[PDB]
Amino acid sequence: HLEIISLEEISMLVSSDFDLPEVLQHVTAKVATQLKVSVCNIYLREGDEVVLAATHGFDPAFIGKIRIKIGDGITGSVARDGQYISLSRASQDPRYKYNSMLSFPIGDKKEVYGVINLNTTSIRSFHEDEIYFVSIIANLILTAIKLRQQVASSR
C-alpha cells in the first residue's frame, strides 16, 4: 500500500550489518501480511536451479531444502523468462481446492537472480498495484543482493 514501508524497514534492508537470510525472512513476512496472503516465498537463482531463501507460510526448516530446476515449475518459467505470471486455478484430487498465485522475478537489465511467490488458497484476483507493490519489493530485494554480494566480497 501507498505510504506502507517503515523507515526501520528500508533501513535494515540497505544497512549492511544484516545478512540476506534475516532480511528476507522479514521481507516475506512483511509482504504476506501486507497483501493479506497466506504464504510468500523467495527463491534465489543458484546454478541451473532456484532454491528457497525465505518463507512466510512454510516452516523456516524448509529454507535450504526446496529446489526448483530452472524451466521446471511455473516458478521455473518465471525464473527463466523474467516475466511474472499470476494465475488462479480450480484443482481437485479424487475423494468420495481453488488457489491463486503470483510469481514475480527478481532481476535486472542483464538477468534474473530469483523469484518471489505469493500463494493464497482462496480464488482471488491479483489487482494491478498489488503487482506494483511486489514489483518494488522485487527491486528492493534485488538491491539487497547486489549491495551485499558484490560490495562485500569485492569491497
**Interacting residues toward its own copies by CB under 8 A:** 1-8, 10-11, 14-16, 108-109, 132-133, 136, 139-140, 142-143, 146-147, 150-151, 154
Question: Quick check: 120 binds Na ion (CB under 5 A)?
Answer: no
Question: Minimum Å distance from CB 95 to its own copies?
Answer: 43
Task: Please identify the residue of the shown chain whose CB is closest to the bound Na ion.
Answer: 117
**Contact call for residue 41 and Na ion (CB under 5 A):** yes
Residues 6+ apart with CB under 8 A from 82: 105, 107, 111, 112
Residue with smaller CB distance to Na ion, 20 or 52: 52
- For its own copies, give the closer residue by CB, 59 or 128: 128
**Comparison of 68 and 141: residue with beta carbon closer to its own copies:** 141
CB of 48 to its own copies, least distance (A): 22
| One-letter-per-residue 3-state SS of the chain | CCCCCCHHHHHHHHCCCCCHHHHHHHHHHHHHHHCCCCCEEEEEEECCEEEEEEEECCCHHHCCCCEEECCCCCHHHHHHHCCCEEEEEECCCCCCCEEEEEEEEEECCCCEEEEEEEEECCCCCCCHHHHHHHHHHHHHHHHHHHHHHHHHHCC
Interaction of residue 100 with Na ion, rule CB under 5 A:
no
Q: Which is nearer to its own copies, 32 or 52 (CB)?
A: 32
User: What residues make contact with Na ion under the rule CB under 5 A?
Assistant: 41, 117
